[PDB]
Amino acid sequence: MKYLPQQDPQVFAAIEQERKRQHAKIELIASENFVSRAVMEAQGSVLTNKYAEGYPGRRYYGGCEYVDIVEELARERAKQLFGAEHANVQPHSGAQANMAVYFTVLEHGDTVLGMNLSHGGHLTHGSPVNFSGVQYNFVAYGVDPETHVIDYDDVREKARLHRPKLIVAAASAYPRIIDFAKFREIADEVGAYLMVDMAHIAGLVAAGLHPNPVPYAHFVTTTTHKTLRGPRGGMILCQEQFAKQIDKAIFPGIQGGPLMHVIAAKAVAFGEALQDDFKAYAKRVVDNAKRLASALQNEGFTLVSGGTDNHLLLVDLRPQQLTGKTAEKVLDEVGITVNKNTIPYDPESPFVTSGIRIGTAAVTTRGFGLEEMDEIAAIIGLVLKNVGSEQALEEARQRVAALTD
Amino acid sequence: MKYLPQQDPQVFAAIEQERKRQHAKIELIASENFVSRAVMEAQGSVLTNKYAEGYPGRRYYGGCEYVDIVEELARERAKQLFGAEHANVQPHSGAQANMAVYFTVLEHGDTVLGMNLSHGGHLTHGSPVNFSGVQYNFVAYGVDPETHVIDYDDVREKARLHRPKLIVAAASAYPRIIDFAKFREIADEVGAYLMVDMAHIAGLVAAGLHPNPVPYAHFVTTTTHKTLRGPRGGMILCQEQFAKQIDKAIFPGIQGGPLMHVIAAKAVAFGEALQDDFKAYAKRVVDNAKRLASALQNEGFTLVSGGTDNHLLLVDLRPQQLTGKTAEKVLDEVGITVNKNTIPYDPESPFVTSGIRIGTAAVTTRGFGLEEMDEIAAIIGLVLKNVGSEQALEEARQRVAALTD
Numbered sequence: 135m136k137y138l139p140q141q142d143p144q145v146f147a148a149i150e151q152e153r154k155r156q157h158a159k160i161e162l163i164a165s166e167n168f169v170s171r172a173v174m175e176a177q178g179s180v181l182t183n184k185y186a187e188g189y190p191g192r193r194y195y196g197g198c199e200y201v202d203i204v205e206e207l208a209r210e211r212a213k214q215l216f217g218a219e220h221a222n223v224q225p226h227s228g229a230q231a232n233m234a235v236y237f238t239v240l241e242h243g244d245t246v247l248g249m250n251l252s253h254g255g256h257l258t259h260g261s262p263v264n265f266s267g268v269q270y271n272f273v274a275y276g277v278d279p280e281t282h283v284i285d286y287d288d289v290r291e292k293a294r295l296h297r298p299k300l301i302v303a304a305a306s307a308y309p310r311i312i313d314f315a316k317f318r319e320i321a322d323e324v325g326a327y328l329m330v331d332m333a334h335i336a337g338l339v340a341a342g343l344h345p346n347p348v349p350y351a352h353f354v355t356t357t358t359h360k361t362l363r364g365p366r367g368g369m370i371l372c373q374e375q376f377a378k379q380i381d382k383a384i385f386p387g388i389q390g391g392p393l394m395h396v397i398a399a400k401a402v403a404f405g406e407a408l409q410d411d412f413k414a415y416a417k418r419v420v421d422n423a424k425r426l427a428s429a430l431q432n433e434g435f436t437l438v439s440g441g442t443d444n445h446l447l448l449v450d451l452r453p454q455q456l457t458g459k460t461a462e463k464v465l466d467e468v469g470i471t472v473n474k475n476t477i478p479y480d481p482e483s484p485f486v487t488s489g490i491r492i493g494t495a496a497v498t499t500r501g502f503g504l505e506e507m508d509e510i511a512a513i514i515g516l517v518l519k520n521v522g523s524e525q526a527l528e529e530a531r532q533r534v535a536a537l538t539d
Numbered sequence: 540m541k542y543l544p545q546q547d548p549q550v551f552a553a554i555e556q557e558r559k560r561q562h563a564k565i566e567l568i569a570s571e572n573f574v575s576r577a578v579m580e581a582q583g584s585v586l587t588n589k590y591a592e593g594y595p596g597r598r599y600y601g602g603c604e605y606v607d608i609v610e611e612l613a614r615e616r617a618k619q620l621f622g623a624e625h626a627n628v629q630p631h632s633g634a635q636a637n638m639a640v641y642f643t644v645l646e647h648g649d650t651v652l653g654m655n656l657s658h659g660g661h662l663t664h665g666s667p668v669n670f671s672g673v674q675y676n677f678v679a680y681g682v683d684p685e686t687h688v689i690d691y692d693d694v695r696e697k698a699r700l701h702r703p704k705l706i707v708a709a710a711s712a713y714p715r716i717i718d719f720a721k722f723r724e725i726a727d728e729v730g731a732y733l734m735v736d737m738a739h740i741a742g743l744v745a746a747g748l749h750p751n752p753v754p755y756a757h758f759v760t761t762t763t764h765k766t767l768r769g770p771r772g773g774m775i776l777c778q779e780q781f782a783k784q785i786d787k788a789i790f791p792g793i794q795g796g797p798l799m800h801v802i803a804a805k806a807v808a809f810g811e812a813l814q815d816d817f818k819a820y821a822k823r824v825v826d827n828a829k830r831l832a833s834a835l836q837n838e839g840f841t842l843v844s845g846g847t848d849n850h851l852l853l854v855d856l857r858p859q860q861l862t863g864k865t866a867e868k869v870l871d872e873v874g875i876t877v878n879k880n881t882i883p884y885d886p887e888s889p890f891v892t893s894g895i896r897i898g899t900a901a902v903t904t905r906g907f908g909l910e911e912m913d914e915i916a917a918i919i920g921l922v923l924k925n926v927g928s929e930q931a932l933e934e935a936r937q938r939v940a941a942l943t944d
């Protein structure tokens with residue numbers, strides 16, 4: 135940086151602390167990643183200065199000729215990546231992508247069927263303190279009590295009973311592949327639209343490591359910043375028949391001017407995802423998650439669903455008589471970042487929980503491989519099995535430091 | 540830039556075209572400005588990699604110690620700038636800032652009183668194709684047919700008749716000072732909350748050139764990117780009594796993870812606004828707008844309300860028998876960017892209009908002064924009075940080029 139250090143010493147010092155923090159810790163928050171320098175340069179561009187309400191070639195402001203090229207590059211690269219008939223790259227976030235789809239097909243008070251929030255569903259999938267739960271009537275389907283895999287018979291029974299206008303599939307903490315074909319079969323049975331929120335697994339979908347929801351869902355929402363490794367923001371994919379309605383839901387519906395600099399960064403991230411090395415990266419993400427899962431099971435940990443098919447895993451800490459809150463706090467003391475997370479049928483509240491959620495997308499981006507996954511598991515074993523030992527915690531800190539340099 | 544040019548030639552070429560375009564044209568879109576290099580550096584930082592749902596010291600993710608400092612710097616600088624009891628610097632945009640306030644105090648279907656959209660009110664102030672108009676019952680107050688100044692007796696009559704739960708004051712195209720004291724007096728008469736959307740005039744408010752709505756309104760919303768000259772995004776200011784509710788409206792209410800890199804850029808822009816030179820800049824904005832207004836009147840143009848008290852002006856093109864659409868198109872041919880804009884009591888639809896909206900915040904930022912305002916007016920006079928003359932248009936292009944270098 136050059137102008138920030140002189141203009142704003144306070145902001146620059148905080149940013150520099152954060153940059154160093156990102157290098158020194160072992161980041162296992164399943165929804166995070168590290169973007170490239172090219173993506174950051176695109177978001178640090180002069181495109182923030184442009185008002186561009188409307189869409190390419192149909193704007194409400196003159197002078198959009200070059201930001202129109204950037205938005206089209208994002209839309210076309212997105213379509214090549216996922217094979218959707220239409221893309222909307224303006225959503226400011228995953229929450230706004232979901233909000234616009236709901237605004238498109240639902241009336242206030244309509245019934246929506248989504249994944250139980252304590253079994254893996256996201257906050258925007260019906261939480262009562264979120265707009266989704268306040269605006270609409272959400273009902274939930276759950277996972278089997280023993281396998282922790284979505285119970286498709288429960289999806290079907292709830293759909294037939296409650297007759298939702300929309301069914302939402304996908305999650306913030308589900309470690310197994312989701313069967314979009316079964317979701318669409320159920321939606322067709324009850325005449326409901328199907329929305330797939332692939333935010334967590336978009337990068338895996340793009341690399342062919344997770345079944346693509348596009349061919350099965352009427353609408354596909356996502357964030358661009360998790361496994362897709364892009365700038366922070368959202369995107370909506372949909373069939374051509376809902377294109378005009380989805381575009382109008384975003385604008386003039388729920389947003390105003392789009393973040394053109396962020397859309398440029400989205401295009402950049404999509405170009406990166408279209409390359410062969412991104413496909414190799416994604417395979418390493420899933421391979422690392424499987425390895426990490428196995429290594430944790432080797433340490434004596436119980437995993438929700440018995441392992442993982444994607445980038446994330448959930449540890450059920452009941453066997454160690456620990457809450458997720460306790461485990462997150464002690465791991466933070468040694469330099470490992472995880473988040474507490476409810477497990478299916480959790481006896482504890484969502485503010486305490488009986489689990490921790492872990493993902494490998496970020497450590498994979500920094501170059502960690504299978505041997506590092508074994509060591510991370512061994513460090514987590516040392517800490518969680520010896521929470522009252524300061525010597526074990528100090529050893530863990532030195533082992534974390536050895537991994538991050 | 541260094542990594543973008545090699546990684547993505549297509550995106551870099553489009554951005555570079557846009558950067559050069561910003562220099563070569565005379566930008567008079569009232570809602571635009573040019574941010575500093577320090578602000579862009581903050582948005583191009585590694586802070587995009589951090590999930591930070593929740594607020595400083597009360598996050599739902601560990602590792603937020605340094606992004607907490609950045610958010611607090613933004614909130615505290617905002618409070619010093621505007622004197623509000625509380626600030627929320629997470630809104631992704633002006634639309635999301637407004638959406639969260641509405642989510643805080645209104646139930647679906649509640650009555651809201653806002654400025655007539657064809658007299659200056661914004662799209663998020665009740666348009667029927669926007670969430671505001673779909674979710675709530677908007678009624679409107681207008682400006683006097685001759686003076687084009689808000690008719691406060693009409694505000695009061697509509698409030699007493701319709702008994703709104705909320706009254707919204709402020710606009711996207713009102714060239715005169717708004718009397719927040721009268722708005723609060725009316726709101727108190729009918730027991731309504733008062734919300735002031737100061738997006739367009741925030742920078743003028745911060746420099747003491749427009750009365751501050753903070754002491755009169757329960758809620759103040761704004762964008763950070765117009766006269767405030769910050770990154771693209773929103774902010775909510777409010778009294779301490781609504782602080783917890785407003786914070787919960789933003790999260791877990793209507794958004795998810797905030798854009799921490801953009802919040803860092805907001806803090807940077809707020810630090811710039813707290814400096815004496817920003818106060819001198821803002822005075823030049825208003826001085827330039829007055830000068831430009833007078834110079835246009837000297838060319839024979841009629842201005843809505845007869846001039847301006849702020850950064851923007853509206854030309855009523857009926858005397859020249861031109862629509863705003865026609866004037867915007869021909870000015871685009873010579874390198875001058877304006878937007879068509881309905882005028883009060885406009886006989887034409889909002890897609891054609893009888894006016895153009897012009898603002899001086901951007902040309903002031905690039906260093907234009909009073910002499911440049913006279914020349915811009917003289918160029919607009921030459922073009923609009925000679926729309927069928929290609930020689931007049933070519934002369935205008937050379938004069939525009941002389942101003943931008």
Ligand SMILES: Cc1ncc(COP(=O)(O)O)c(CNCC(=O)O)c1O
Binds near residue numbers: 230331333794
């Ligand atoms: C499945 C899923 N959907 C939407 C969001 C919201 O995105 P945002 O950009 O934060 O508004 C999320 C976010 N999850 C954060 C977390 O999982 O850590 C999500 O998972």
Ligand SMILES: Cc1ncc(COP(=O)(O)O)c(CNCC(=O)O)c1O
Binds near residue numbers: 389632710736739762
């Ligand atoms: C008064 C007023 N309020 C909210 C917005 C919305 O902001 P955004 O960041 O675009 O969601 C605006 C925007 N106006 C754009 C225009 O005036 O050109 C506004 O004016």
